[PDB]
Scaffold this active site. Structure first.
Site, PDB file in Angstrom:
ATOM      1  CG  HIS A 192       5.783   2.943  -5.896  1.00  0.00           C
ATOM      2  ND1 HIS A 192       5.470   2.975  -7.237  1.00  0.00           N
ATOM      3  CD2 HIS A 192       4.604   2.972  -5.233  1.00  0.00           C
ATOM      4  CE1 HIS A 192       4.157   3.018  -7.378  1.00  0.00           C
ATOM      5  NE2 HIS A 192       3.609   3.018  -6.177  1.00  0.00           N
ATOM      6  CB  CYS A 224       5.853  -0.293  -1.111  1.00  0.00           C
ATOM      7  SG  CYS A 224       4.416  -0.559  -2.180  1.00  0.00           S
ATOM      8  CG  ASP A 238      -1.763  -1.251   1.321  1.00  0.00           C
ATOM      9  OD1 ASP A 238      -2.151  -1.802   0.269  1.00  0.00           O
ATOM     10  OD2 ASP A 238      -2.023  -1.695   2.459  1.00  0.00           O
TER      11      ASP A 238
END
Length: 280
Positions: free
Chosen positions: A204, A65, A62
């Site tokens: 990310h 990360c 989610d």
């Protein structure tokens, strides 16, 4: 150029290979993260006479990360995020270093506000702090300070490799994650020296393996402690004004860290090595 670096443990892939569940787009995403970080000169930017190539190892999860990536970089599997999240929470909500961590957060957040003239009220300060706490409770992405807290949970420094800005054709927005996170509210004698090294790109987080690991077993790799312009990486939340410090610039001058002081902090919490390198 004699520049400061440090060794770090590469992910144990043998554990990773046993429990990999479909993330079909893994290779595609990893490749795009590699190219982005290399082209911007944030990853694998240096060359030395005595060669390694770090590669982003992406993961599912989610938000950005962070905990999945941290879990991957630490133990070779990402389903340890749940234990990290609760530990991150308990450290903020009930930890003994809570007050000190809060001071470090507000002080840096105040300085970033001064660059944009956005002064927050006291009620707003307490609201932002509880939003930070809520983000760690047990979806929505964790923030910069949570990485700093994560370092305290692991009692281990964290180095994040990232670009400084989001760019269009020409920066338009900042990226706050790149740099060094030291477990400053834990005595250095009670901390591990070898850092957890993560990368950040396209919103990310990811772990970092080396290309040599594809050929054979390789335990150690090298990560720089400066950027590609030989400037020391930012030390996140490294300034703690005293408990007596009042939020209400001779006073401000006293708390700011010099380059010598920053180096001293790095020596305290990391095993800094110096090698001759040059940028590409």
């Amino acid at each position: 150029m004699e520049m400061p670096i440090c060794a770090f443990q590469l992910p144990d892939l043998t554990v990773y290979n046993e429990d990999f569940r479909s993330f079909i787009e893994r290779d595609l995403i990893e490749q795009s993260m590699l190219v982005a970080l290399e082209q911007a000169g944030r990853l694998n930017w240096w060359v030395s006479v005595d060669s390694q190539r770090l590669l982003p190892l992406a993961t599912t999860g989610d938000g950005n990360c962070l905990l999945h990536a941290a879990s991957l970089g630490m133990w070779g599997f990402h389903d340890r995020d749940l234990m990290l999240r609760k530990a991150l929470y308990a450290l903020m909500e009930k930890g003994v270093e809570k007050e000190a961590l809060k001071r470090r957060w507000r002080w840096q957040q105040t300085q970033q506000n001064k660059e944009s003239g956005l002064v927050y009220t006291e009620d707003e300060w307490q609201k932002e702090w509880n939003e930070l706490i809520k983000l760690a409770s047990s979806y929505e992405s964790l923030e910069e300070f949570h990485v700093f807290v994560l370092a305290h949970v692991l009692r281990r420094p964290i180095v994040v490799v990232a670009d400084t800005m989001l760019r269009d054709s020409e920066a338009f927005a900042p990226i706050p994650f790149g740099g060094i996170y030291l477990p400053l509210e834990v005595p250095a004698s009670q901390c591990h020296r070898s850092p957890l090294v993560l990368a950040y790109d396209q919103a990310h987080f990811s772990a970092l393996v080396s290309m040599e690991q594809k050929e054979n077993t390789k335990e150690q790799a090298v990560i720089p402690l400066t950027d590609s312009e030989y400037k020391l990486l930012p030390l996140h939340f490294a300034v703690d004004p005293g408990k007596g410090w009042e939020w209400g610039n001779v006073r401000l001058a006293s708390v700011i860290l010099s380059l010598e002081v920053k180096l001293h902090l790095l020596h305290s919490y990391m095993n800094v090595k110096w090698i001759p390198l040059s940028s590409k």
